[PDB]
């Protein structure tokens, strides 16, 4: 069942704010050429910089942020990987400024591009268990996990949900295996054989506006729960009832992926990922995407659906705290568009965020 199958034609039922959330959102380091309406509060910032990392913390705060997604790029690509680390080293070196109640802990957004993994490249191409061997590729997915979890073991601020450090797979759809229940088990044995048995808690990514099951081989009994890329992406061409129902169209399709992932015949925890806007017209004037300007009335609608599709994570996923590429980021701008004459959204959406996801 795919979204016009799951959009109900009647309102949104009002789902109250009783617990606190756990939010993550994605933090990202943006390309300041781009032609932004408005800018950072903090200004222009660099992955080397880390002066901006303290105003983000309190922002995060602001906005009831209970931690950030870092990029992770595999180990296959050295220097990035290399990179990734020391990105997040230095934000966990900011952290020692702030007290345990006002700490915004991370975790990893993993992309395995690196590893050129495909339909007919599989991450266990190679793999026999029975002889002891191990794909090559699987050895580098393995070794990113390893890495991960060495992090973790060793650093209270990576993210921990019920124990179990948090990673993001983007993409995970595509992660290809002949297998994937059997390469994720031999990934997590790996784990709790070298980290006196800890256990992961993996997220994994499938593209907006498909159904929840269509990838069910690649995530029953291989991740632990799945979201849907954000839905503020999609073709302004052929997409009418889409946009004009577009609260109800997520609440729809979000709170149906809750319901079906969670049927005892998969397993899966959903988590709806939301977002305040999009421009994917920023980084190239051709994309097609249509852009979702920035409203209040719609972000709080799209944020009652969410609680409408939370399970027992009682997670939600923000793109994004600062993704500026692409137009979704919530970070404080300042109070005036370039121009310097119009109200920009300044902290606006960091006290929405709050409103709608902590107990008043
Ligand atoms: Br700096
Ligand atoms: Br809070
Ligand atoms: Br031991
Ligand atoms: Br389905
Ligand atoms: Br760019």
Redesign the pocket.
Known sequence: ??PEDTFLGSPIPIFEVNEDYNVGAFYKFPNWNLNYNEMPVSGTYTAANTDQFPTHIRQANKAGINFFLFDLVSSQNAGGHSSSFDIVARYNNELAGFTPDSIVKYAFNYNYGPLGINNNNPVDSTTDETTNTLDPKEIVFQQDFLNIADLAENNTNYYRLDGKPVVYILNAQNLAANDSPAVFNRMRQAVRDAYNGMELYIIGMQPQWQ????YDFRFVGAVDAVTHNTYMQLNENNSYERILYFDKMVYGAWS??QE?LGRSEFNLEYIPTISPSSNYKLQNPNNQNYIFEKNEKLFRSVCNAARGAVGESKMVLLESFNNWNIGTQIEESNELKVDGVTPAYGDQYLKILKEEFKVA
């Open positions: 069942f795919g159904p929840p099951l269509r149906y992926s079906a």
